[PDB]
Structure formats: structure tokens, C-alpha cells
Write a protein that holds these residues in place. Structure first.
Motif, mmCIF file in Angstrom:
data_model
loop_
_atom_site.group_PDB
_atom_site.id
_atom_site.type_symbol
_atom_site.label_atom_id
_atom_site.label_comp_id
_atom_site.label_asym_id
_atom_site.label_seq_id
_atom_site.Cartn_x
_atom_site.Cartn_y
_atom_site.Cartn_z
ATOM 1 N N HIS A 1 0.870 -1.168 0.095
ATOM 2 C CA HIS A 1 0.136 0.112 -0.012
ATOM 3 C C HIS A 1 0.860 1.151 0.101
ATOM 4 O O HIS A 1 1.201 1.724 -1.119
ATOM 5 C CB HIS A 1 -1.063 -0.056 1.250
ATOM 6 N N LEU A 2 1.366 1.627 1.015
ATOM 7 C CA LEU A 2 2.388 2.719 1.164
ATOM 8 C C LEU A 2 3.402 2.824 2.112
ATOM 9 O O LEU A 2 4.019 3.635 2.375
ATOM 10 C CB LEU A 2 1.400 3.997 1.941
ATOM 11 N N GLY A 3 4.012 1.370 2.082
ATOM 12 C CA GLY A 3 5.418 0.987 2.649
ATOM 13 C C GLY A 3 5.696 0.915 3.982
ATOM 14 O O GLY A 3 6.809 0.845 4.236
ATOM 15 N N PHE B 1 0.737 -8.206 9.542
ATOM 16 C CA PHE B 1 -0.431 -7.067 9.785
ATOM 17 C C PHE B 1 0.289 -6.011 9.521
ATOM 18 O O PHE B 1 1.291 -5.594 10.261
ATOM 19 C CB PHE B 1 -1.169 -7.431 10.969
ATOM 20 N N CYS B 2 -0.284 -4.881 8.660
ATOM 21 C CA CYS B 2 0.341 -3.604 8.664
ATOM 22 C C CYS B 2 -0.918 -2.758 9.366
ATOM 23 O O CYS B 2 -1.855 -2.606 9.045
ATOM 24 C CB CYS B 2 0.403 -3.145 7.263
ATOM 25 N N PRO B 3 -0.304 -2.087 10.253
ATOM 26 C CA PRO B 3 -1.182 -1.355 11.306
ATOM 27 C C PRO B 3 -1.488 -0.030 10.553
ATOM 28 O O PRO B 3 -2.236 0.795 11.117
ATOM 29 C CB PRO B 3 -0.377 -1.234 12.333
ATOM 30 N N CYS B 4 -0.675 0.569 9.568
ATOM 31 C CA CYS B 4 -0.947 1.569 8.931
ATOM 32 C C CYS B 4 -2.297 1.784 8.532
ATOM 33 O O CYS B 4 -3.032 2.789 8.654
ATOM 34 C CB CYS B 4 0.210 2.031 8.045
ATOM 35 N N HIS B 5 -2.896 1.064 7.872
ATOM 36 C CA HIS B 5 -4.118 1.089 7.301
ATOM 37 C C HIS B 5 -4.824 -0.327 7.368
ATOM 38 O O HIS B 5 -6.059 -0.726 6.671
ATOM 39 C CB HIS B 5 -4.376 1.592 5.847
ATOM 40 N N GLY B 6 -4.326 -1.222 7.943
ATOM 41 C CA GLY B 6 -5.292 -2.544 8.211
ATOM 42 C C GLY B 6 -5.166 -3.570 7.280
ATOM 43 O O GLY B 6 -5.926 -4.233 6.797
ATOM 44 N N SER B 7 -3.755 -3.799 6.690
ATOM 45 C CA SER B 7 -3.833 -4.585 5.474
ATOM 46 C C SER B 7 -3.231 -6.105 6.278
ATOM 47 O O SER B 7 -2.373 -6.148 7.262
ATOM 48 C CB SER B 7 -2.743 -4.470 4.421
ATOM 49 N N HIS B 8 -3.625 -7.170 5.775
ATOM 50 C CA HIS B 8 -3.259 -8.458 6.503
ATOM 51 C C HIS B 8 -2.698 -9.381 5.332
ATOM 52 O O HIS B 8 -3.411 -9.724 4.142
ATOM 53 C CB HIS B 8 -4.527 -9.281 7.031
HETATM 54 S S1 FES Z 1 0.778 1.255 4.717
HETATM 55 FE FE1 FES Z 1 -1.169 1.143 4.429
HETATM 56 S S2 FES Z 1 -1.850 -0.942 5.065
HETATM 57 FE FE2 FES Z 1 0.364 -0.868 4.935
#
Ligand code: FES
Length: 141
Positions: free
Chosen positions: A85-87, A102-109
Motif C-alpha cells: 500500500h504505502l510502505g 499485519f500492517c497497522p498503518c491502514h489494516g492490511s493482512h
Molecule cells: S501502508 Fe497502508 S496498509 Fe500498509
């Protein structure tokens, strides 16, 4: 030359070694038997991103579990630790809803093969040029 050489001889099952390469983290996870089985239990039709995103093989390869690891046994999962998403840096140790990261920046799994399953990230975590050059060392690059 850019290539680096990582000693993975002490990495036990269920441990991720994180090493910096080209300014960013590379995750080297020695997967557990649970991680491997579950990765192999996912059908391609269930995946958000069916492309392997793997620098070592054909760029049109399918994101089967086997096309996500360095070895046929499936123990060695090597990926850029860079959210698609954004790194941001994904959090591991079997985190999120799919037994992976899990990416807590915007909730990707991502799942146990680093494949995207939920959230805004569009792609599976990419796999760098990576191969074993003997029993104990992975060349990155
Ligand atoms: S940077 Fe947005 S979900 Fe990972």
C-alpha cells in the motif's frame, strides 16, 4: 556488487530474521509446519492477488505456496518487509487474521505465504532475488 550473503544457520522454525538490503527490510522466515500447511491449504481462487510477485521465477507465475518459497519443502519464505500500500513495515510473528503479517498503518493482512488477504494493500509482499548458495547461506540480489 550489490548482493549480500545472509547466514541462516541459526534460524529455528517459527523465527523471522530481518536484514536490511537496499535500504529496506527483508524478512527471512523459517516457517513452522502449521504455517506451511495453511499456506498450502489456500486455493488460488481465494486470493486477492494471484501473481507470485517473485523476482526468481516467471513474472506471470501463480501465487501458489510453492511459488512463494525458496525451497520445495516450503520452509524458507523470503520477502521484502514493505507494505504494498504505502510502505509501512508489516508486523509478523503470526499476526493479523490470516496467520501471517499485519500492517497497522491502514489494516492490511497477509497470510502465511505473505499473500494479501484483506485491507487496502493491492499486492502480495514481493520476493527479492534470493537463493541458497550452500546449506547455510542465502544470497540476496
Ligand atoms: S501502508 Fe497502508 S496498509 Fe500498509
Amino acid at each position: 556488487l550489490a548482493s549480500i550473503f545472509v547466514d541462516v544457520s541459526s534460524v529455528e522454525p517459527g523465527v523471522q530474521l530481518t536484514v536490511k538490503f537496499l535500504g529496506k527490510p527483508i524478512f527471512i522466515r523459517r516457517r513452522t509446519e502449521a504455517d506451511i500447511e495453511l499456506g498450502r491449504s489456500v486455493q488460488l481462487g481465494q486470493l486477492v492477488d494471484t501473481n507470485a510477485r517473485n523476482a526468481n521465477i516467471d513474472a506471470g507465475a501463480e501465487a501458489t505456496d510453492q511459488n512463494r518459497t525458496l525451497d520445495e519443502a516450503g520452509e524458507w519464505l523470503v520477502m521484502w518487509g514493505v507494505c504494498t500500500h504505502l510502505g509501512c513495515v508489516p508486523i509478523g510473528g503470526v499476526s493479523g487474521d490470516f496467520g501471517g503479517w499485519f500492517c497497522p498503518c491502514h489494516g492490511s493482512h497477509w497470510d502465511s505465504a505473505g499473500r494479501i488477504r484483506k485491507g487496502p494493500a493491492p499486492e502480495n509482499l514481493p520476493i527479492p532475488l534470493a537463493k541458497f548458495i550452500d546449506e547455510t547461506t542465502i544470497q540476496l540480489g
